[PDB]
Amino acid sequence: TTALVCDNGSGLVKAGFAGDDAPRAVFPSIVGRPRHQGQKDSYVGDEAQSKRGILTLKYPIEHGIITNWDDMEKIWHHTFYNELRVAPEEHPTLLTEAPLNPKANREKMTQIMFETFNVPAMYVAIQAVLSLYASGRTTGIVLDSGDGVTHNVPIYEGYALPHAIMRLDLAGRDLTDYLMKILTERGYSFVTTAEREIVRDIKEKLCYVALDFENEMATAASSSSLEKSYELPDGQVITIGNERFRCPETLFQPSFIGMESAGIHETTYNSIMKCDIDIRKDLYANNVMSGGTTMYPGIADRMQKEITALAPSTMKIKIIAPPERKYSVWIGGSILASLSTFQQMWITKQEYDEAGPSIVHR
Amino acid sequence: TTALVCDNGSGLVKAGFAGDDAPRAVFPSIVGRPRHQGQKDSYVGDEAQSKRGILTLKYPIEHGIITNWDDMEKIWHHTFYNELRVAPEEHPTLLTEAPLNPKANREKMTQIMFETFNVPAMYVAIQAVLSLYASGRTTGIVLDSGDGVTHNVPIYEGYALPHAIMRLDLAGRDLTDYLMKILTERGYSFVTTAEREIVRDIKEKLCYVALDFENEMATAASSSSLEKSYELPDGQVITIGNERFRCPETLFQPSFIGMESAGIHETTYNSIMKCDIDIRKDLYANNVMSGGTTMYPGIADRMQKEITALAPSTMKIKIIAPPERKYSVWIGGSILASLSTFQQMWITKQEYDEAGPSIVHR
Amino acid sequence: TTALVCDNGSGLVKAGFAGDDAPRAVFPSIVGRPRHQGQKDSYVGDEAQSKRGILTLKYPIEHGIITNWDDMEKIWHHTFYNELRVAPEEHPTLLTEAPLNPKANREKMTQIMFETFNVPAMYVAIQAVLSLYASGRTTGIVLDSGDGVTHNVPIYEGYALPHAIMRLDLAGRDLTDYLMKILTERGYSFVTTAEREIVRDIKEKLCYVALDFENEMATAASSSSLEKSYELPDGQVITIGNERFRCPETLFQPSFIGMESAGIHETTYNSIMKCDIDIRKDLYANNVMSGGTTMYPGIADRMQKEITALAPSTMKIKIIAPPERKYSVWIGGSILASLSTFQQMWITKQEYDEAGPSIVHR
Amino acid sequence: TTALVCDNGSGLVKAGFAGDDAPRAVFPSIVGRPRHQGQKDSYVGDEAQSKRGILTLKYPIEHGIITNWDDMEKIWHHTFYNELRVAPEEHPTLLTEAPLNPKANREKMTQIMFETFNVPAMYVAIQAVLSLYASGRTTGIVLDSGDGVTHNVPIYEGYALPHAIMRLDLAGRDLTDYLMKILTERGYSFVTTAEREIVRDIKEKLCYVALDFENEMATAASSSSLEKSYELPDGQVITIGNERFRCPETLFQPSFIGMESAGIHETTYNSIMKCDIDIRKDLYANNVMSGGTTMYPGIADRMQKEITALAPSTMKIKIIAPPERKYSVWIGGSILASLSTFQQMWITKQEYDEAGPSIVHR
Amino acid sequence: TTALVCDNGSGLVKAGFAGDDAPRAVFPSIVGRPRHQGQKDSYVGDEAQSKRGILTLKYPIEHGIITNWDDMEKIWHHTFYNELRVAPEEHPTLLTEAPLNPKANREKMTQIMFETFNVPAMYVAIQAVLSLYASGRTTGIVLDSGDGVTHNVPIYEGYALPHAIMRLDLAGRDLTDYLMKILTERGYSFVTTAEREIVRDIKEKLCYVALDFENEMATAASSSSLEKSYELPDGQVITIGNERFRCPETLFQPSFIGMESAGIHETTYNSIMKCDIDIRKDLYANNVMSGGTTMYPGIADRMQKEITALAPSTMKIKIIAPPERKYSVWIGGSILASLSTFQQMWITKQEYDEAGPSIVHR
Amino acid sequence: WXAXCPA
Amino acid sequence: WXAXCPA
Amino acid sequence: WXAXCPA
Amino acid sequence: WXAXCPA
Amino acid sequence: WXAXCPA
Numbered sequence A, B, C, D, E: 001t002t003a004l005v006c007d008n009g010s011g012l013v014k015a016g017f018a019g020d021d022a023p024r025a026v027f028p029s030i031v032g033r034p035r036h037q038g039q040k041d042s043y044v045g046d047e048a049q050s051k052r053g054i055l056t057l058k059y060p061i062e063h064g065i066i067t068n069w070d071d072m073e074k075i076w077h078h079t080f081y082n083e084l085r086v087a088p089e090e091h092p093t094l095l096t097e098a099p100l101n102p103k104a105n106r107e108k109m110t111q112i113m114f115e116t117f118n119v120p121a122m123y124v125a126i127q128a129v130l131s132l133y134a135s136g137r138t139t140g141i142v143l144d145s146g147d148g149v150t151h152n153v154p155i156y157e158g159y160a161l162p163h164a165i166m167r168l169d170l171a172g173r174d175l176t177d178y179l180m181k182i183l184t185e186r187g188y189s190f191v192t193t194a195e196r197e198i199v200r201d202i203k204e205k206l207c208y209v210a211l212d213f214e215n216e217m218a219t220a221a222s223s224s225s226l227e228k229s230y231e232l233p234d235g236q237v238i239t240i241g242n243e244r245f246r247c248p249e250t251l252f253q254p255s256f257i258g259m260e261s262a263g264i265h266e267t268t269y270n271s272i273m274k275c276d277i278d279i280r281k282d283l284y285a286n287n288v289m290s291g292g293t294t295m296y297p298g299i300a301d302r303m304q305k306e307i308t309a310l311a312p313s314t315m316k317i318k319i320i321a322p323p324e325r326k327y328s329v330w331i332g333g334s335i336l337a338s339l340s341t342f343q344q345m346w347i348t349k350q351e352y353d354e355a356g357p358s359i360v361h362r
Numbered sequence F, G, H, I, J: 001w002x003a004x005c006p007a
């Protein structure tokens, strides 16, 4: 009966039943295989995290694109039968995706759902618009920036503005890699796959967004007041200085990792510029930030500052970035699925069988 | 009971009950449809203005001719049931038109009234003569120049002089388009439909009529004392120079937009010349200016100057252009409808059914 | 002595000496700066194309408007001294522009010519009318649609009809961007500036205009007979399906990229409607298509079809779109400059110095 | 039926039937030959120990390598037919070896089993992993240090970590020789082969591991409280001072006998360092000490101290060294053989005959 | 006057004067201390090699990181005063490093130069880019793989591409250790520090890279035709079979020693993928292999094969690996130092004193 | 442009 | 991706 | 290194 | 209009 | 061993 929402993010798999205010199964989208000889052939999610020291971990998803279907399928298997404990044929499902992903990706997923899982009916939604539902708004700009891919979708009074959707491949995993390089110059070394996950943990705890990056650098140079300590799994102590903010800074200056794209504050701005002047004001007053990377301390304030400078004077910049923004997409899914209007939008197996995979593009 | 007056202008829809000194429902004659995908199929009037950034706006009326009956009908629907909150079958109605509109237009309107709205009785009047009633005069020349079409009707002691009625398609919307082109050379760009409406707003606030156009140009070239600032909806600042009067100048020199017609000051003069010499004096002393385009600051003075030059010496040129001239037509309607003599002129459904649409030409 | 013609297009810089039947220096209007650290500060034209992988490329011109004067100046410098190998003070020069560009743009160019380059005399001409000279006609409609901006200028027996000039910002670069988005859904990704240029190359080789867009879509869905292969610079193979015509289709349906403007076939038609009925026939029989976007295979036939439908029956629609239409503007310049009558039109430095920049508006 | 486990150590031969909790035949791996003329040609095990005064004793195994195949074979003969009283063709057998022994050694053994003894099936296992089974663990570090060779194998959750296996030739026999040299300076002399065995007996009874070697030396210098008495076979009395701990100290300081290797406490540590950080904690909490040299009193405490210093603070060092650790390998064998899963791993004569000796490397 | 180039590799110290085509002092970066008691406290380089049997040898450098500053300093002392016979204050010096070494390392070196040695001026360069100069190229990929650390730096037309620099700790010393383990299973044993150096010598003479590793293994199994003989310092004869290529194979399959990194052929490929498509072709045609590990016979051919498979068809893979590639870094140093442009890049003591150690990061 | 569109 | 970037 | 690997 | 001008 | 050490 009750629809099952499943957010196939590139970082975490967030699944749960519609109507709830929180996902029930949240775990890493990771498949691990034994690096050495010896006992499972592979481990998934928390299993992989638990035994990661001896596993080669792979992400089946990259930048919102499924690259390894075998592993992808495996995760879904694991999800439905081990995490949620539910037969998929009992419920409608809601899957999500990032804007502009290759159509083959979308269709392939659908195929699997109507073959391996025999899902009664399904629907694929844009992560961004779901986030908007969670925010209680019909107008605003959704900035979804998680592990996989950053994107920006302007929405106005319940209407889409597809011609101004931005996509930026700069995301959480890139910040991770960048951070590794920085830790290297500091005096450490994180190069194994298991080490990758450690690095991630550090980032999530000690990084923050400087208000004025340059002054923050100066202060860091001036003294050790910003330095923090992080204890590694084996008891060693990591001392971190200016890396605590030099890392996340990359979001505003992608050039740090060789990208030509402007920072996310300009990406947002640009999307706004692509919309007709009549609605720009409304969008300025309703920026919605969501997704894991928007969890950095002070990122909203930094964002405000950046936009304020770019935007015309007097155009109040209001940024909405509430607690739990990390799960706003999943929440949106819960909402939408429970919405009775929406029920007409389900894609049934019946329709699929008759029309073929192309049907999903609707 | 109380007659309902409805001025179907090409710019604004002005409706209200007879006896009142002001229209109750005044809003743009615009129907808007969603430019992008997403929620109504269409929006009307203020709705359209409110969400215009995402709508393609259409005017159902052009130059006083109804070009889109579906949209026209829709506006009337909206008017009666959403703006005035009244069932049309309860009241006589008064509609208006500009001189020389195609007879098919007139009849089609009538048909709708006796089908869709089931109006008890109705009458179609010339906008010009209504304006004259509002001015408290029986003799004069009515210059009706609004959004749609400019026209000029000479009236003498309660008698019409149809052989000297002038019609000029140059009107408010043409001034709008011309202004756009000028703003372009200034350094701006207003090409979308939503932008059109913005341009209109500017015009209505910052344009005025130069007394001596050439000297005004010289002064504008000399310095920035005439420049004004206009803040756009998104906070940008428009700096406007000589466009503040170069735009409205077109009314006196239609050649600016490629028309062969002489300016409105000569149009008026010509109408006078077509009348028998005996009454020309009376007409010179009673020019009545009404309609939205006559709202430009100093246009009356400019007009006086122009006519004074054209007219014989000593022929006092008196131009009447009172406050609220913008609504003089509607006011005239209120008056006429309340007039008891007039009651014999209503066209009843009964008569219509028996004679057919041709009956309106009376 | 011999006048120097220089077509400052937004795509290509086309310069050469008057009297020749072809430009001598044709190269991209691009200025590139090192994305990473290392050797020139910047590269121009073919240099930029050669090393584009490590450069951030900028176009100084957008939609026919010069946005970056420093880079613009640089290109001219490069042109005159590196491509043509000639001191500018030795020759009269002819520059071109699109209709309705902001007057400040025009004047600024002129200023540079009389300061940095010390050009003896110069003249700025509309690209459209030059194209007409190249076609050997005095009557027709010039459809200039290149990289920067599309525009349409009706000309009759040597006289201009300025009140009916159309300007449409939809142009080659927009088609490029649109195509990128399409390639994304196909399964590829072109987001860097260098990649932009690659995309352009593809377009120029594999796109064509479908006669009946809908049927063409159906056929593309039906089979792979329309698919082509394009080898990328690094040896990868791109397989392209319906994108080979879905891209250029945008010219007839601007709504694909969120614009409200009607397609170019209606733009042309509308311009015709704005002309007095007496000359519409002559214009119908002499449509002239020129500029790079008119190079798509079959675009003329498609155009004919579209106009034929819009135009009254029996109004023979003749479209002239000869080989080398790509350079018709430059050719026109060669012609005009060699024309002896024209010599009186040069704007000398002397005149400029006395009157000031305003002089160019003549 | 019941598998026969045989631990071919360099010190003792420990054999017995799987399922039992203790080996049935435990005796020295020694072959003795008459030093003088005289009656067997040779004596084995306890025979050799009994008559050792007139025999030249040889060990067929050195550092885990079989050096004398004739004598080796002889011991097996003796074992099976004199100690266990069982025909080898009746049972599967389990042999053991130390990590990194030369492959020729391994194969040669196998050959003998399938020729001289006609063993139905056999398997060769690493002594270290068997010890781990005896400890009831799937994760830990096995420190096997017996007579022959010391080695260290890290194991994690049932998986091997071969890239971090350490081998140290320092073992019980080296301690024996070192002790001899020390006894010499004390005032005694043990140089014959028979005397060697006496020395060994002393070691096993009176040596212990000092907690703080230096302080222990000081105390020994201070007084005779540490001195002990040992009565020799012929009734003489040996008085032993600081040699009671100076001998075993060599395990922590191999430099005493000219080796470059670090002590066993660093060997263990180093192995840990070679494992990925993620599992180092688990290994620290599960050190398993087994084999005869770990029988010295207080060696575990000393070990803990040493590791504690080397390991990061807070990394609880837990050392498991239970009673009967001396036979943990044999016990492990009993376990594994009784394990039903394991049955698939037996190498049958059939397979051997077809593939050849190389088959054992699996 | 003449600059002094000093390549502080982890294997060999290569120093000499700029302008020469070969280093003058080439010797092992080893410091040895007496294992037993006895006469110097320590021996360096060739001294250490000469008396290595009684010395504990240490490398002050590991993976390009200086771990023992006292010993490092000692080597420099020895170099300048015993090998080159020159006072350091007389000449500018050029030191080198591998990419991504910890900044503290870099600075510490600098400090020493401006304290202990009082070097007039100095500069630290990346080993990779120097190699490129030696190859006579401005474009290519430098694969520097020596004793210490393997790294890969893509360079394009004189510009760096830092965002795609790869670092791989797999290097010559790891191959050495791996080989030891293999020799063990063969039947030998090399565990002392002196033995390490012997092993190295063997490797450098008898190892080669198999074209098709698997077939080579098969052949080795098939017969002794690949076996070679190597006489040890004490006259013993080593017979080596498949180890002659199984060892170096590790460079293509790091998993042999427990690493997760892909082989060097994929490392290179990956770096290429991280560069913008526009320049990938140029890089494919200019791979430059240098450093001691690239001395293995046939490694270039193997490399070509591997890359050819990975790269798109038709992308000619050209690998440049000339004679003397072993010293290309040193050569590059000679070149750069003699280059007059470069002189502005020297870091003077003056600047150092004023700014502090941070200055080197430029 | 200085309004409407970028340029 | 099947071109540009990896995915 | 001061973590990860030895150096 | 149905001729001359649009309307 | 057949080299290094005895065994």
Ligand SMILES: Nc1ncnc2c1ncn2[C@@H]1O[C@H](COP(=O)(O)OP(=O)(O)O)[C@@H](O)[C@H]1O
Pocket: A008, A009, A010, A011, A012, A013, A145, A146, A147, A148, A149, A172, A173, A200, A203, A204, A205, A290, A291, A292, A293, A294, A295, A296, A326
């Ligand atoms: N406290 C935190 N601060 C910053 N980033 C975080 C935090 N917690 C999680 N993240 C990041 O969020 C990403 C996952 O968030 P999510 O939005 O769910 O990704 P996705 O939707 O792409 O799966 C990871 O890259 C993770 O590092």
Ligand SMILES: Nc1ncnc2c1ncn2[C@@H]1O[C@H](COP(=O)(O)OP(=O)(O)O)[C@@H](O)[C@H]1O
Pocket: B008, B009, B010, B011, B012, B013, B145, B146, B147, B148, B149, B172, B173, B200, B203, B204, B205, B290, B291, B292, B293, B294, B295, B296, B326
């Ligand atoms: N302050 C103003 N100055 C000039 N024009 C105005 C002003 N206010 C309204 N208008 C113009 O008046 C027109 C609408 O007036 P109206 O006479 O009601 O038109 P219509 O009768 O054709 O509907 C519009 O074109 C509008 O721009």
Ligand SMILES: Nc1ncnc2c1ncn2[C@@H]1O[C@H](COP(=O)(O)OP(=O)(O)O)[C@@H](O)[C@H]1O
Pocket: C008, C009, C010, C011, C012, C013, C145, C146, C147, C148, C149, C172, C173, C200, C203, C204, C205, C290, C291, C292, C293, C294, C295, C296, C326
């Ligand atoms: N074969 C072709 N097919 C379609 N478009 C082309 C072709 N060759 C060039 N173009 C396009 O023409 C434009 C440049 O033409 P041009 O008319 O010179 O532009 P501009 O005059 O604005 O500089 C570019 O956008 C380019 O892609």
Ligand SMILES: Nc1ncnc2c1ncn2[C@@H]1O[C@H](COP(=O)(O)OP(=O)(O)O)[C@@H](O)[C@H]1O
Pocket: D008, D009, D010, D011, D012, D013, D145, D146, D147, D148, D149, D172, D173, D200, D203, D204, D205, D290, D291, D292, D293, D294, D295, D296, D326
């Ligand atoms: N009480 C003891 N204390 C110390 N060492 C002992 C003791 N008993 C036996 N040993 C030593 O243990 C070694 C034999 O143990 P074991 O582990 O079975 O050797 P291996 O497995 O190599 O045959 C001998 O070197 C012997 O001296």
Ligand SMILES: Nc1ncnc2c1ncn2[C@@H]1O[C@H](COP(=O)(O)OP(=O)(O)O)[C@@H](O)[C@H]1O
Pocket: E008, E009, E010, E011, E012, E013, E145, E146, E147, E148, E149, E172, E173, E200, E203, E204, E205, E290, E291, E292, E293, E294, E295, E296, E326
């Ligand atoms: N003939 C050879 N074949 C293979 N490797 C060699 C040869 N000669 C030297 N080497 C290896 O090269 C390494 C030293 O080379 P080098 O590039 O100078 O190292 P580094 O630059 O790190 O000091 C050593 O590991 C050595 O074994």
Ligand SMILES: [Mg+2]
Pocket: A009, A127, A144, A145, A146, A147, A291, A292, A329
């Ligand atoms: Mg997300």
Ligand SMILES: [Mg+2]
Pocket: B009, B127, B144, B145, B146, B147, B291, B292, B329
């Ligand atoms: Mg009106």
Ligand SMILES: [Mg+2]
Pocket: C009, C127, C144, C145, C146, C147, C291, C292, C329
């Ligand atoms: Mg052009």
Ligand SMILES: [Mg+2]
Pocket: D009, D127, D144, D145, D146, D147, D291, D292, D329
């Ligand atoms: Mg043992």
Ligand SMILES: [Mg+2]
Pocket: E009, E127, E144, E145, E146, E147, E291, E292, E329
């Ligand atoms: Mg090197």
